[PDB]
């Protein structure tokens, strides 16, 4: 439905109100589910629209774009922006919107970790630790969470992906951070800009 | 050294070779669980004349293989005059003690936590006191990897000297590699010496 509504909003044969109607339903399809990968590509494509900046929930798409864990405030903001059939809590606990918000919150906690306990992820997202393990394993079942679960030690590790050849990639990144040191030379303070562009580069 | 004394090419049998062969069997029974195989390049007179002359020693190894200490004791008392005649009585007593130690070392492969009375019954020592003595001696000499629990009267076998992450192994491997490097430069010298000289 997101690709449906979005690429109907990009076509130009339709009436303009109907373009932005398809666009706002693409924003509904942005916020109501959590991001799948091509889904998130279409959401960032929506983020490049000034007409989406004309929409009411561009701050919600902004926090989707900045990989932000959604707090209750902007939650209730776009909850004021829903249609009541889209407000369906059909015996799933919290709503499809809200369960997918918890999905996106766990998703943002995934994108930023490398390990977190069931307890620290539970109190991180205001959920029980056993429920943190449960829904975290259900998202690894959904695959959009990835890592490895130690139930006994109580930690959903992410795939930590950090070692010494990764640190050798960080040595090439240390060449590019000597370049970023040149950026700090030209950047951080203007007296430091003049005097460091003198001293570290010309001397 | 005894092995290198036996390997010597020989047309006639000498008493030095006989005595070195007897002491070879004794030291191999002490150091290893059984008699170490001599190389194929050993003299024919060893297997033809020296072997059946020192019959008591191969008989001793034959009784050692059954893992019975009382029967080895009976055989040591049987040929005691022959062992004292060769003036190696003492090494055969070390063979008896090494058999006891071999029997206690066989327990690590099957048991983990074993009673001292059970050990005294299996190894044939009579009393948990002698079992505790033997286990303590064996831990001190680095022969077994075990612990003693006096309260319950138990012996706990561990069997984990190393995980091979120490520098100690780094230094061990460095020294062993230096020995192999020495041998190769030595082997290079021997090979060069042989290349120089060639036949005509």
């Amino acid at each position: 439905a997101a690709q449906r509504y979005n690429e109907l909003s990009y076509k130009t044969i339709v009436h303009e109100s109907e373009r932005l109607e398809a666009l706002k339903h693409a924003l509904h399809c942005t916020i109501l589910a959590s991001a799948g990968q091509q889904r998130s590509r279409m959401l960032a494509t929506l983020f490049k629209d000034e007409r989406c900046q004309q929409l009411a929930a561009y701050g919600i798409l902004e926090k989707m774009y900045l990989d932000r864990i959604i707090r209750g405030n902007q939650l209730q903001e776009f909850a004021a922006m829903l249609m009541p059939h889209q407000k369906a809590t059909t015996a799933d606990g919290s709503s499809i919107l809200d369960r997918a918000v918890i999905e996106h919150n766990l998703l943002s906690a995934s994108k930023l970790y490398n390990n977190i306990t069931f307890e620290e992820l539970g109190a991180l997202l205001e959920i029980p630790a056993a429920k943190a393990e449960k829904i975290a394993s259900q998202m690894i079942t959904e695959g959009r969470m990835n890592g490895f679960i130690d139930q006994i030690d109580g930690i959903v590790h992410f795939e930590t992906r950090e070692a010494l050849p990764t640190w050798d990639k960080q040595i090439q990144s240390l060449c590019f951070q000597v370049n970023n040191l040149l950026e700090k030379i030209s950047q951080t303070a203007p007296e430091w800009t003049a005097q460091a562009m003198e001293a570290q580069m010309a001397q | 050294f005894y092995e290198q004394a036996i390997t010597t090419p020989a047309m006639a049998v000498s008493h030095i070779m006989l005595e070195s062969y007897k002491k070879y069997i004794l030291v191999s029974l002490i150091l290893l669980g059984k008699v170490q195989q001599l190389p194929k390049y050993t003299s024919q007179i060893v297997g033809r004349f020296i072997k059946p002359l020192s019959n008591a020693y191969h008989e001793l190894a034959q009784v050692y293989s059954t893992n019975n200490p009382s029967e080895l004791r009976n055989l040591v008392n049987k040929h005691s005059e022959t062992f004292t005649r060769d003036n190696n009585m003492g090494l055969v007593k070390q063979c008896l003690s090494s058999l006891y130690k071999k029997n206690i070392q066989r327990l690590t492969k099957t048991f983990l936590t074993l009673s001292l009375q059970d050990m005294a019954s299996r190894v044939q020592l009579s009393g948990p006191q002698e079992a505790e003595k033997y286990v303590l001696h064996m831990i001190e000499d680095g022969e077994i990897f075990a612990s003693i629990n006096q309260k319950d009267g138990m012996v706990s076998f561990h069997d984990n000297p190393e995980k091979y992450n120490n520098p100690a192994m780094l230094h061990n491997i460095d020294q062993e590699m230096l020995k192999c490097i020495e041998l190769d430069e030595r082997l290079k010298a021997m090979d060069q010496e042989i290349t120089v000289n060639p036949q005509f």
Partner: protein, 221 residues
């Protein structure tokens, strides 16, 4: 020998049913599936004395063949399944395919008459249950490095002895890769595997042979 004589009567679906029946006798659901499949087709050609029943066995064949992908999916069964009497079979294939044991068993228990009366269904149901529980376990296992047997027992809602039997069964599957402390009743899986280890030893061994070739020649006169 039907191959020998080819008339084309009305009865054709019945005999094809018998082949499946034979496979009922045998338990070779692979062949029975084709049997009931064509038989059901022939029943559509004939009418429904047996048609629904043939479909019942056909769905049963699908589950025993363990290929739910096209339960009704020919052309016709999909509309045929709509028959509420038979619709339960769709529920079975669903709950089986979806693996909702509660729902699946619910249909079994709720409909003894509809589902359970069949002795083959009643017969194979446990095997079916093993398959479902096995798959659910497979789904359960992948994320875990280590797990508690009692956790599994609570999870799957089956007895610990049953759990152990199933686990061992999974080992037969070569599915479980890890050891189980029977006394402790826990399972450790080799989640992080490594066939990294051998090569150092292998190279060592190759060198050892090298040493062999070198030593025998050199040491030898």
């Amino acid at each position: 020998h039907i191959k020998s004589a080819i008339p084309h009567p009305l009865i054709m679906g019945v005999i094809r049913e018998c082949g499946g029946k034979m496979h009922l006798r045998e338990g070779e659901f692979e062949k029975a599936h084709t049997d009931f499949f064509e038989a059901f087709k022939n029943y559509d050609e004939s009418g429904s004395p047996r048609r629904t029943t043939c479909l019942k066995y056909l769905v049963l064949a699908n589950m025993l063949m363990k290929s739910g992908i096209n339960p009704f999916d020919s052309q016709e069964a999909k509309p045929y399944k709509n028959d509420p009497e038979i619709l339960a079979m769709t529920n079975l294939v669903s709950a089986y395919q979806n693996n909702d044991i509660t729902e699946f068993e619910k249909i079994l228990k709720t409909n003894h008459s509809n589902i359970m009366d069949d002795p083959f269904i009643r017969e194979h149901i446990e095997e079916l249950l093993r398959n479902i529980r096995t798959q659910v376990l497979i789904k359960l296992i992948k994320p875990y490095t280590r797990i508690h047997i009692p956790f599994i027992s609570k999870e799957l809602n089956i007895d610990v002895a049953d759990v152990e039997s199933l686990l061992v069964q999974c080992i037969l599957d070569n599915t479980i890769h890890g050891r189980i402390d029977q006394v402790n009743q826990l399972l450790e899986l080799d989640h992080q595997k490594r066939g990294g280890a051998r090569y150092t030893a292998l190279d060592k061994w190759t060198n050892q042979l090298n040493s062999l070739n070198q030593a025998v020649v050199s040491k030898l006169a």
